[PDB]
């Protein structure tokens, strides 16, 4: 009994610094990624040339209209996206095929590129894993290691990396994650909620301004 | 098990459990110290303050 307990504790410990080393590596990678973008922009400005950042592979989509008076095409699309309520949020692998799909539900959803804090804030607080078709909160790393252990995801930091950086197993990581059930935004929306964001409304693409909405949502 | 969901962002102990890296994170690091190099191409300034 003592040998088994010691063996359990040891292997569990060896898993712990493994998580610690991975999380440290991801944090260093993020800082090195932001440093290089700043250096690339600075040197381009110094040379008079211009630099185009990478277009982010990750998008966060929030549904902003109720389940009423929606055309069946938009209804089916949001069913595919798993946006079955207002304020529901999802991480989607933004690519060529997703863009035209979102062009149809543009009046009904708003989307933009989330930053590290937003994706970290959402998973820690609104993060509920989908285990055995049940909505289970991510209260420990045991759930993550037992549900995504076949894709080398062992902790919350590993899941955050696979989501934020759009890893090879992004589909599995996102599908494991129940849609975020965000609250109504503190402070409220704009005067009109159902115009285009570019026209003073709230629907449609908003790029780096989705973070400001998410802070109110949380 | 898990009778109540505790937010790691408001409860330090839960954050410690889920993230065994918050013990040594060191968010605020010195990169700029003082020796800042003002770098902007004169062509960029001209095209910026153009028209």
């Amino acid at each position: 009994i003592v040998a088994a307990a010691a063996e359990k504790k040891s292997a569990r410990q060896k898993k712990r610094e493994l998580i610690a080393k991975r999380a440290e590596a991801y944090e260093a990678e993020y800082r090195a990624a932001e440093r290089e973008q700043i250096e690339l922009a600075r040197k381009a400005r110094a040379e008079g040339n211009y630099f185009v950042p990478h277009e982010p592979k990750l998008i966060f989509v929030v549904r902003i209209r109720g389940i009423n008076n929606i055309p069946p095409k938009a209804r089916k699309i949001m069913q595919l996206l798993r946006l079955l309520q207002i304020n529901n949020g999802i991480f989607v692998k933004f690519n060529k095929a997703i863009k035209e799909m979102l062009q149809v539900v543009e009046p009904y959803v708003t989307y933009g590129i989330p930053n590290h804090k937003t994706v970290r804030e959402l998973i820690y607080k609104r993060g509920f894993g989908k285990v055995n078709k049940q909505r289970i909160p991510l209260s420990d790393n045991a759930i993550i290691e037992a549900a995504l252990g076949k894709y080398s995801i062992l902790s919350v930091e590993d899941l955050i990396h696979e989501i934020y950086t759009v890893g090879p197993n992004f589909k599995q990581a996102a599908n494991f994650l129940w849609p975020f059930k965000l609250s109504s935004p503190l402070g409220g929306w704009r005067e009109r909620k159902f115009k285009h964001f570019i026209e003073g409304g709230d629907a449609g693409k908003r790029d780096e301004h989705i973070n400001g909405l998410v802070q109110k949502m949380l | 098990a898990h009778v109540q969901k505790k937010n790691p962002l408001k409860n330090k102990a839960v954050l410690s459990r889920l993230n065994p890296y918050a013990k040594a994170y060191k968010a605020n690091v010195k990169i700029n110290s003082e020796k800042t190099p003002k770098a902007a191409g004169e062509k960029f300034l001209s095209v910026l303050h153009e028209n």
């Binding site: 040339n49 630099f51 690519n95 060529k96 | 028209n51």
Partner: peptide, 21 residues
């Protein structure tokens, strides 16, 4: 098709021209 990657856009050959509607 993946998103367009970061690249360079040399303007010394074609300096930006001011456009007015």
């Amino acid at each position: 098709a993946p998103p367009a990657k970061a690249h360079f856009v040399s303007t010394e050959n074609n300096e930006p021209v001011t456009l007015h509607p």
